[PDB]
Design a protein around this nucleic acid. Structure first.
Ligand SMILES: NC[C@@H]1O[C@H](O[C@H]2[C@@H](O)[C@H](O[C@@H]3[C@@H](O)[C@H](N)C[C@H](N)[C@H]3O[C@H]3O[C@H](CO)[C@@H](O)[C@H](O)[C@H]3N)O[C@@H]2CO)[C@H](N)[C@@H](O)[C@@H]1O
Ligand SMILES: [Mg+2]
Ligand SMILES: [Mg+2]
Ligand SMILES: [Mg+2]
Ligand SMILES: [Mg+2]
Ligand SMILES: [Mg+2]
Ligand SMILES: [Mg+2]
Ligand SMILES: [Mg+2]
Ligand SMILES: [Mg+2]
Ligand SMILES: [Mg+2]
Ligand SMILES: [Mg+2]
Ligand SMILES: [Mg+2]
Ligand SMILES: [Mg+2]
Ligand SMILES: [Mg+2]
Ligand SMILES: [Mg+2]
Ligand SMILES: [Mg+2]
Ligand SMILES: [Mg+2]
Ligand SMILES: [Mg+2]
Ligand SMILES: [Mg+2]
Ligand SMILES: [Mg+2]
Ligand SMILES: [Mg+2]
Ligand SMILES: [Mg+2]
Ligand SMILES: [Mg+2]
Ligand SMILES: [Mg+2]
Ligand SMILES: [Mg+2]
Ligand SMILES: [Mg+2]
Ligand SMILES: [Mg+2]
Ligand SMILES: [Mg+2]
Ligand SMILES: [Mg+2]
Ligand SMILES: [Mg+2]
Ligand SMILES: [Mg+2]
Ligand SMILES: [Mg+2]
Ligand SMILES: [Mg+2]
Ligand SMILES: [Mg+2]
Ligand SMILES: [Mg+2]
Ligand SMILES: [Mg+2]
Ligand SMILES: [Mg+2]
Ligand SMILES: [Mg+2]
Ligand SMILES: [Mg+2]
Ligand SMILES: [Mg+2]
Ligand SMILES: [Mg+2]
Ligand SMILES: [Mg+2]
Ligand SMILES: [Mg+2]
Ligand SMILES: [Mg+2]
Ligand SMILES: [Mg+2]
Ligand SMILES: [Mg+2]
Ligand SMILES: [Mg+2]
Ligand SMILES: [Mg+2]
Ligand SMILES: [Mg+2]
Ligand SMILES: [Mg+2]
Ligand SMILES: [Mg+2]
Ligand SMILES: [Mg+2]
Ligand SMILES: [Mg+2]
Ligand SMILES: [Mg+2]
Ligand SMILES: [Mg+2]
Ligand SMILES: [Mg+2]
Ligand SMILES: [Mg+2]
Ligand SMILES: [Mg+2]
Ligand SMILES: [Mg+2]
Ligand SMILES: [Mg+2]
Ligand SMILES: [Mg+2]
Ligand SMILES: [Mg+2]
Ligand SMILES: [Mg+2]
Ligand SMILES: [Mg+2]
Ligand SMILES: [Mg+2]
Ligand SMILES: [Mg+2]
Ligand SMILES: [Mg+2]
Ligand SMILES: [Mg+2]
Ligand SMILES: [Mg+2]
Ligand SMILES: [Mg+2]
Ligand SMILES: [Mg+2]
Ligand SMILES: [Mg+2]
Ligand SMILES: [Mg+2]
Ligand SMILES: [Mg+2]
Ligand SMILES: [Mg+2]
Ligand SMILES: [Mg+2]
Ligand SMILES: [Mg+2]
Ligand SMILES: [Mg+2]
Ligand SMILES: [Mg+2]
Ligand SMILES: [Mg+2]
Ligand SMILES: [Mg+2]
Ligand SMILES: [Mg+2]
Ligand SMILES: [Mg+2]
Ligand SMILES: [Mg+2]
Ligand SMILES: [Mg+2]
Ligand SMILES: [Mg+2]
Ligand SMILES: [Mg+2]
Ligand SMILES: [Mg+2]
Ligand SMILES: [Mg+2]
Ligand SMILES: [Mg+2]
Ligand SMILES: [Mg+2]
Ligand SMILES: [Mg+2]
Ligand SMILES: [Mg+2]
Ligand SMILES: [Mg+2]
Ligand SMILES: [Mg+2]
Ligand SMILES: [Mg+2]
Ligand SMILES: [Mg+2]
Ligand SMILES: [Mg+2]
Ligand SMILES: [Mg+2]
Ligand SMILES: [Mg+2]
Ligand SMILES: [Mg+2]
Ligand SMILES: [Mg+2]
Ligand SMILES: [Mg+2]
Ligand SMILES: [Mg+2]
Ligand SMILES: [Mg+2]
Ligand SMILES: [Mg+2]
Ligand SMILES: [Mg+2]
Ligand SMILES: [Mg+2]
Ligand SMILES: [Mg+2]
Ligand SMILES: [Mg+2]
Ligand SMILES: [Mg+2]
Ligand SMILES: [Mg+2]
Ligand SMILES: [Mg+2]
Ligand SMILES: [Mg+2]
Ligand SMILES: [Mg+2]
Ligand SMILES: [Mg+2]
Ligand SMILES: [Mg+2]
Ligand SMILES: [Mg+2]
Ligand SMILES: [Mg+2]
Lengths: 49, 272
RNA sequence: GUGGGAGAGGGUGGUGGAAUUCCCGGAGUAGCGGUGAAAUGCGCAGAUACCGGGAGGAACGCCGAUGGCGAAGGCAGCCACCUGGUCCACCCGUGACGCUGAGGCGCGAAAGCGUGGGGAGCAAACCGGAUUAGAUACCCGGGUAGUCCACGCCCUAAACG
RNA sequence: CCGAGGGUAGGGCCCGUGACUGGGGCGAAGUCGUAACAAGGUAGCUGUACCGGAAGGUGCGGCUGGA
RNA sequence: CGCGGGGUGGAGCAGCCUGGUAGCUCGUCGGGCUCAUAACCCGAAGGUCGUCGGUUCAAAUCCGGCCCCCGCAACCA
RNA sequence: GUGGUUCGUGGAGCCAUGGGGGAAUCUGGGCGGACCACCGCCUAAGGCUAAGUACUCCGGGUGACCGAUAGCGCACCAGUA
RNA sequence: CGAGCUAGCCCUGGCCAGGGUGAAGCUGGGGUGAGACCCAGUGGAGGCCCGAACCGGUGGGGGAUGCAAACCCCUCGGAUG
RNA sequence: CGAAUGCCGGCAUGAGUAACGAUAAAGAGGGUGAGAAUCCCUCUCGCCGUAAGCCCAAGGGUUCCUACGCAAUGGUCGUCAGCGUAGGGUUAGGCGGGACCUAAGGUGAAGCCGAAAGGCGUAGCCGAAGGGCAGCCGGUUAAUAUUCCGGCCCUUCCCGCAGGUGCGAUGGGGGGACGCUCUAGGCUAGGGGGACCGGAGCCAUGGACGAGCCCGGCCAGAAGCGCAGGGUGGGAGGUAGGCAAAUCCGCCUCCCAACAAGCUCUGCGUGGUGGGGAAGCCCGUACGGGUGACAACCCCCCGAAGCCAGGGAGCCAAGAAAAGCCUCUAAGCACAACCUGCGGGAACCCGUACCGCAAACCGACACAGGUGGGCGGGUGCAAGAGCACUCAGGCGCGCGGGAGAACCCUCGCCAAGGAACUCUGCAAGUUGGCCCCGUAACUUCGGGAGAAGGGGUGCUCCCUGGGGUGAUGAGCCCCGGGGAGCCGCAGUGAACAGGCUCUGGCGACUGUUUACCAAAAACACAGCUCUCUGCGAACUCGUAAGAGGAGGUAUAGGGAGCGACGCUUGCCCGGUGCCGGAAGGUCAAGGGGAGGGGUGCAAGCCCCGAACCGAAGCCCCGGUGAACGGCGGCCGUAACUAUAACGGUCCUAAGGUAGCGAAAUUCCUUGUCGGGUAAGUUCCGACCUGCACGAAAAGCGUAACGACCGGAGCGCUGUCUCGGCGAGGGACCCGGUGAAAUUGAACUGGCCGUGAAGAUGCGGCCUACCCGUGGCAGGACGAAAAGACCCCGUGGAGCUUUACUGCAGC
């Protein structure tokens, strides 16, 4: 039947986006750590135009 | 009135509709004086505070005039009488001679063509509005104010009305659609007559949908749910509560009074 | 027809005083209610009795009759509008147009039923208190429908002269 | 083609029978009470309504076949 | 089988738990009123207390054994 | 009414303080564990002040520390696949 | 950290072949004092019926290291709400 | 290190076993090649064809196209590829988004709140398949085109000239601008027919040179018309409203229209012109090209769900906003500006390949699963997106060849009986579409109803009645009615297409639910009642601010229960609850201080502390059951027995009424009596001894409604006696690829004993050459899961109250 992953570019940047994470105190920390851990990608790689 | 139906479908037998004869060939509302976008929504910021709402026909707000000392002395002619989805009372639209249009909740009687007005002057006739003092003790009246300049608030439901009782200082005793004798200030307007369309209390919704149309989702009894989400809940084949009847949140609901005790509004009240 | 006459005939609107019950205040105590007698109950948490003030509903004392009106059932404070019947006089108009009335249609106390209002007093049922051998009764204190209004059904009667 | 009748299916009336049931009529000396007739010891009678072992009682209105 | 409750004049109930004292309503018997019966009035009679044991000076009453009676439990499989 | 102190209400002081009352300027105030006397110590309700002290992303040294299933997860283009 | 599955609400758009059945209201006639009402004709009402898409998930079989961590076949519910 | 269902890695085992992913299907000749069932070509055959065919969007991100290649990827092969290497490939003022607008909702100056982080928040900003807005038809490439080019037609800016007018706002108005079902008239898309036009061809096989067969007969295109159709009154006075101002808007009052007459605004035709252009045939493709061609480009009919569009009619639930657009004026400026023509000039940024109901998206896979929108031809069946065949177009689902066992899946058929099968007609059949007959109880007058039960249904000729498009006709297209006749076993001849009935229970009904074992008698539901709430409402979320409630106001809103409708809902307020009681009893801080205590030499300072005054709360006094609840026992009695209308006594707060009753409630129980039956622990009707119904956790009913749950008939039948035959896909044999749970090691026989009590393994005897293959499942206390029942642990959570102890809240 229908599954749980229904990709959607908008929803994805809108939710796990970078400006998205900067906006909140908890998300900013999410960035810190990922930066502090090394992670090549701080946030998901949404795309297209 | 109240239209009836032959049983050509169970439900549309007991079903009963209103009679919109009193509706002056109007229907399409009046831009300008209303309508405004009406933000429908069953909960506040986030959560749902009143339960069981949502869904139900889209609606446009008819921005009515609920404080008439706006036009003291300026007479206006009642133009139409139309339907208002936001209330039980039908409403009348009227053109002042000032050239301004505005709606008023329509009183029983008031016919299209009639002239109506407000102010200390104003003749005591259906439609006219005046400060409570200047109104004849005993006359009935609707659309009362509670405090000078704050707008109408009592007897505005379909065909409801309040009767003046006496005077007493800068105050005048009323008798609200509920039976409470209240002391209102003299300077509160109150347009004369009863609200009209009193057959409203007689409409037999009819089916399940009918309720759904007016935006009210099904209502489930506490008795149906479990202990986890309401007092009356569990365990075997139904049950008799098992304790003093209570609400989802738990306070008694078969008798417990609510008005907050030490309210300042107490002293101006006298009844039930 | 013309011209008048009496009447609680009918409907709808509006209003007036008497008394009851409750409410508030005054003042005022040790009992009031009720019966054949009492008991329940009511009262020092201020009763009963009295005065002032306010709400609400129902019913209209004297006139009032052994009277009147209505086809009947029935109709009783006052005012107004709409309305039917009914008698008198004048002997003008019509010109036999008259009577009864199977069915039909309509009205139709009361209780009762529907929906909505209203609810002072009364009061089926019902709770008490007496009475009795026992009382689901007659007697007493409570008291719900009902009683009253709108509209809709119900068509009964010792509807009797 | 029609057509006596034969088979199918569904209706209408009447007749008989049926556990138990409902009241009834009748049956010399069974039980409980005492409703009515004298003011029947609550005048009765009534239509309706609720109630009660039973008679019956009560309400609302009516009637004289009572005062 | 197990839990606890109960056997009292003819009927239905008290009386114990703080042992010595059996009480009430009805019914039954005798007498009255009435023509007579009921009602009502006046008096009177009747109880090995389920039984076999002992506990104490003394048991309806305290304690164990059986005879019926009533109610409650007989769950997980 | 509470916190801090070894201090959990204890005879419970001191140091801080939300609440209410509400001063004094040296013959003025706080403390020495209820309180009082005596004898003493200090001078609150404004602020700053290096040094010794902590830490190791980075650089260096040295190991009765590992030696590729160990040693950091990674000796290798790993915080990758 | 998650309402891209799922539940609910909000704003905004989209979708439902083709058949049945015949509501009220109209129009004519009948009726009466005027009515109630009765007939026709029109009319197209409905949490209306049949039934595709679509939305489901009744009964049985198969599938059960599957085609599939919810499947398939037969059948069945609803489908202007 | 020998064990931890231990950790990591490696390799065995089952095993050449099961599988190789749809039962829509393949056969052959000819190329290429080291190697072809699998690649390329051709011929033949089968599948889809409201798609398995085309077009978008989302997602995907190089998968598109060429050349060169098979190591691996492909469930086999592979020269093929969605694969590996390389290069090429996406072109926009008009399509889509943005330098336009606004909705929910974000964000957010002013402000408001919160220990901080942070929370709210009218303006404004953001915010999109919603509003606004300017491109159609063809051609070319190996790959892109509404993008390039070709033809025709537009949009804005900016700059000039020609003039018109007081121009002029982020401000005022107008408009933009709206529901649902049903529809009118005219159109186009789409389709059918053609004796007419235009076409390579073709006379087969017995007949046919024929109005013969086959193939095709348009597309776009401004102004100008013409045909539809939408919008709209025109003047003038007065004007206090439209938050400054208006000449505009509104509101009055006099004239003229009421008509679409007249302006406009779209759709449709017609249109200068531009372009396309079948079959067959020749070729060479991996495909396209050439000819057919000066191709024709004609007339009728069907016909939209689309267009005119802001069309109309009806209805109740009463149906976005802002901007563009017009209009109106203000500060300002009126040598500005703005409006109308004509020219020139200027016009950025992003997307375009390809997949796209799928091998390129979501499912670890080239996964029978899922995935919004548009097109979806023809014939026939009453209609239809249905069904069957088929256009166009695309597939034969990436392992094959045999054989023709059991058994499995799926499918067909049956003698005679027919439910005897069985928990149960479960499953399977029967019926089946349309038309016309003809339809019962009961009923809430609708219904039940497709009741039930029947006949008709194909072709041929003859006669005859309607329409519609055309003129009142021909044709073409729809409905008909009658009458003769013909052929079959059979005429909705193939596909799609109810089995029917009686009866009871349960619930009113449509609806809802346990995604993934429960679709119900559960939930919801209109309706019924109680109760709270006067408005800064009650109530709920939040610490607050604030928000919902509600821009609502007692015919309104919150809670609770019952659950349409009919008939009805009895007694108990003693307890618990809530409601009412300005009296009393008790009651904390505090107020009050009689009095006592510690120090001082004293003033003092410092502690205790009885009266008394002190709230709610409880106690106390009443109301109240559609509030929490409850609603008896033991005797006796009637002139046959029997039974008890009557009585007696005890305890209650009061002593369950009507109605129902062996029940969804009944233990004893298959109670007992009746019915159905050959026989009936079920069913149905009765009785009442109701273990243990009973009145809003409602009582007894009720037409209708049901994938609910029993009982019964008729019909039909492989369910069965009791099986048999047949088909296909596996099973089996061959080639290719080739797993898995499990596994102390194995050289793993029967009885009878014994053993921790169920022995291949010990004892005694009996039996038994070695190794495979198909099968059956009794055993290996067979696999699977540290048993989910149970008990244990002073283990864990979920839930309740008059458990304890707090907290919110009041
Ligand atoms: N025909 C009698 C009807 O029924 C009732 O009457 C019936 C009863 O009331 C009546 O019962 C009477 C009773 O009143 C009286 N107090 C006691 C008497 N023993 C009974 O008598 C009855 O029973 C006996 C035998 O048992 C018979 O022989 C006698 O005839 C009979 N009437 O017996 C009658 C039937 O037999 C009505 N009261 C009466 O109005 C009506 O007419
Ligand atoms: Mg607006
Ligand atoms: Mg919130
Ligand atoms: Mg938020
Ligand atoms: Mg009502
Ligand atoms: Mg509910
Ligand atoms: Mg539940
Ligand atoms: Mg929850
Ligand atoms: Mg709870
Ligand atoms: Mg239960
Ligand atoms: Mg409960
Ligand atoms: Mg009279
Ligand atoms: Mg004369
Ligand atoms: Mg007559
Ligand atoms: Mg009457
Ligand atoms: Mg009456
Ligand atoms: Mg009374
Ligand atoms: Mg007596
Ligand atoms: Mg009385
Ligand atoms: Mg009989
Ligand atoms: Mg006697
Ligand atoms: Mg008597
Ligand atoms: Mg009497
Ligand atoms: Mg009577
Ligand atoms: Mg268990
Ligand atoms: Mg502390
Ligand atoms: Mg100090
Ligand atoms: Mg010190
Ligand atoms: Mg010291
Ligand atoms: Mg420092
Ligand atoms: Mg080493
Ligand atoms: Mg090594
Ligand atoms: Mg390592
Ligand atoms: Mg009609
Ligand atoms: Mg229809
Ligand atoms: Mg429907
Ligand atoms: Mg359907
Ligand atoms: Mg070991
Ligand atoms: Mg093999
Ligand atoms: Mg094997
Ligand atoms: Mg095998
Ligand atoms: Mg195999
Ligand atoms: Mg395959
Ligand atoms: Mg690649
Ligand atoms: Mg190649
Ligand atoms: Mg391979
Ligand atoms: Mg090769
Ligand atoms: Mg390719
Ligand atoms: Mg490649
Ligand atoms: Mg924008
Ligand atoms: Mg907004
Ligand atoms: Mg915010
Ligand atoms: Mg905002
Ligand atoms: Mg904006
Ligand atoms: Mg857009
Ligand atoms: Mg555009
Ligand atoms: Mg292409
Ligand atoms: Mg403007
Ligand atoms: Mg505007
Ligand atoms: Mg089509
Ligand atoms: Mg030939
Ligand atoms: Mg054209
Ligand atoms: Mg102005
Ligand atoms: Mg060509
Ligand atoms: Mg319209
Ligand atoms: Mg804006
Ligand atoms: Mg201007
Ligand atoms: Mg730019
Ligand atoms: Mg493309
Ligand atoms: Mg699609
Ligand atoms: Mg695969
Ligand atoms: Mg494949
Ligand atoms: Mg797939
Ligand atoms: Mg789909
Ligand atoms: Mg068809
Ligand atoms: Mg199909
Ligand atoms: Mg057979
Ligand atoms: Mg046969
Ligand atoms: Mg059988
Ligand atoms: Mg058998
Ligand atoms: Mg059965
Ligand atoms: Mg079946
Ligand atoms: Mg049934
Ligand atoms: Mg149901
Ligand atoms: Mg489930
Ligand atoms: Mg579901
Ligand atoms: Mg608010
Ligand atoms: Mg609001
Ligand atoms: Mg309510
Ligand atoms: Mg319930
Ligand atoms: Mg229920
Ligand atoms: Mg009750
Ligand atoms: Mg009580
Ligand atoms: Mg009680
Ligand atoms: Mg009480
Ligand atoms: Mg109280
Ligand atoms: Mg107190
Ligand atoms: Mg029974
Ligand atoms: Mg039997
Ligand atoms: Mg039998
Ligand atoms: Mg029972
Ligand atoms: Mg029950
Ligand atoms: Mg109940
Ligand atoms: Mg019920
Ligand atoms: Mg259903
Ligand atoms: Mg269902
Ligand atoms: Mg059935
Ligand atoms: Mg049978
Ligand atoms: Mg047969
Ligand atoms: Mg078989
Ligand atoms: Mg086979
Ligand atoms: Mg053995
Ligand atoms: Mg052995
Ligand atoms: Mg051995
Ligand atoms: Mg096997
Ligand atoms: Mg096992
Ligand atoms: Mg275990
Ligand atoms: Mg323990
Ligand atoms: Mg937990």
């Amino acid at each position: 039947m229908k599954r749980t992953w229904q990709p959607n570019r908008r929803k994805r940047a809108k939710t796990h986006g970078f400006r998205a994470r900067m906006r909140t105190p908890g998300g900013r920390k999410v960035l810190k750590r990922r930066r502090q851990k090394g992670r090549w990608r701080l946030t998901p790689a949404v795309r297209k135009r | 009135a109240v239209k009836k139906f032959k049983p050509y479908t169970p439900s549309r037998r007991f079903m009963t509709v209103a009679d919109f004869s009193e509706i002056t060939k109007t229907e399409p509302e009046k831009s300008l004086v209303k309508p405004l976008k009406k933000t429908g929504g069953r909960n506040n910021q986030g959560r749902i505070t009143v339960r069981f709402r949502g869904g139900g026909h889209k609606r446009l707000y008819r921005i009515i005039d609920f404080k008439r000392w706006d036009k003291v002395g300026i007479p206006a002619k009642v133009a139409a009488i139309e339907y208002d989805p936001n209330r039980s009372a039908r409403i009348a639209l009227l053109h002042y001679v000032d050239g301004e249009k505005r709606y008023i909740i329509a009183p029983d009687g008031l016919q299209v063509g009639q002239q109506v007005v407000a102010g200390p002057d104003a003749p005591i006739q259906v439609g006219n509005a005046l400060p409570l003092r200047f109104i004849p003790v005993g006359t009935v009246v609707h659309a009362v104010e509670l405090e000078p300049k704050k707008g109408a608030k009592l007897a505005r439901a379909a065909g409801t009305s309040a009767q003046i009782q006496g005077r007493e200082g800068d105050y005048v005793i009323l008798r609200l659609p509920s039976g409470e004798l209240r002391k209102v200030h003299g300077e509160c307007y109150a347009t004369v007559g009863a609200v009209g369309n009193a057959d409203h209390k007689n409409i037999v919704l009819g089916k399940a949908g009918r309720s759904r149309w007016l935006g009210r989702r099904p209502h489930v009894r506490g008795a149906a749910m479990n202990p986890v989400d309401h007092p009356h809940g569990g365990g075997e084949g139904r049950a008799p509560r098992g304790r003093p009847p209570a609400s989802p949140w738990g306070w008694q609901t078969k008798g417990l009074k609510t008005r907050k005790r030490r309210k300042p509004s107490s002293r101006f009240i006298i009844a039930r």
